[PDB]
């Protein structure tokens, strides 16, 4: 499935799309990607829209 990550920072706004077999693996993907950017904080997930958000 296609999932999305919304990055909601004070120094960064954006989105990534990634492929993964399910949402636990997409999580693991997106936290690595968020680490690249330096962005961490409150993680949430919208099953309707297969989208994670991370909000600093
Ligand atoms: Zn696939």
From Swiss-Prot:
Disulfide bonds: none annotated. It is found in: Secreted, Cell wall. Sequence repeats lie at residues 2-56. Coiled coil: none annotated. It comes from the Bacteria. Transmembrane segments: none annotated. This is Immunoglobulin G-binding protein G. The gene is spg. The chain holds residues 303 to 357 of 593 of the full protein.
């Amino acid at each position: 499935m296609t999932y999305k990550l919304i990055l909601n920072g004070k120094t960064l706004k954006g989105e990534f799309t990634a492929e993964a077999e399910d949402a636990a693996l997409a999580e693991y993907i997106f936290r690595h990607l968020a680490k690249h950017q330096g962005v961490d904080g409150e993680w949430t997930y919208d099953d309707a829209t297969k989208t994670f958000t991370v909000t600093e």
